[PDB]
Design a protein around this ligand. Sequence first.
Ligand SMILES: CCCCCCC(=O)OC[C@H](COP(=O)(O)OCC[N+](C)(C)C)OC(=O)CCCCCC
Ligand SMILES: CC(=O)O[C@@]12C[C@@H](C)[C@@]3(O)[C@@H](C=C(CO)C[C@]4(O)C(=O)C(C)=C[C@@H]34)[C@@H]1C2(C)C
Ligand SMILES: [Zn+2]
Ligand SMILES: [Zn+2]
Length: 52
Amino acid sequence: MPHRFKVYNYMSPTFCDHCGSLLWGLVKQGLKCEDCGMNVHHKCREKVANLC
Ligand SMILES: CCCCCCC(=O)OC[C@H](COP(=O)(O)OCC[N+](C)(C)C)OC(=O)CCCCCC
Ligand SMILES: CC(=O)O[C@@]12C[C@@H](C)[C@@]3(O)[C@@H](C=C(CO)C[C@]4(O)C(=O)C(C)=C[C@@H]34)[C@@H]1C2(C)C
Ligand SMILES: [Zn+2]
Ligand SMILES: [Zn+2]
């Protein structure tokens, strides 16, 4: 099954589970999967393996 990513606001430092770098910024830093909790940059969403 595909992931179900939503824009998300992180309150502690969080790394993108796809590309390894920090989700930088004060708000809306990345996307969180509703179902497995994986965190990714907006631009990394289309590239992540899609087995949730
Ligand atoms: C590839 C694009 C790079 C362009 C330049 C960005 C820059 O230098 O500063 C601007 C963004 C804005 O912070 P924002 O949180 O408002 O949103 C920007 C990122 N996002 C759209 C993903 C939420 O400001 C910050 O990141 C704040 C740094 C906070 C760290 C505190 C130590
Ligand atoms: C308790 C706490 O940490 O408050 C934070 C401030 C700064 C220092 C951050 O810790 C941040 C969490 C994220 C998500 O990864 C990115 C950062 O803003 C970032 O780019 C860097 C250099 C540190 C991160 C969150 C909040 C609530 C803004
Ligand atoms: Zn998922
Ligand atoms: Zn990434």
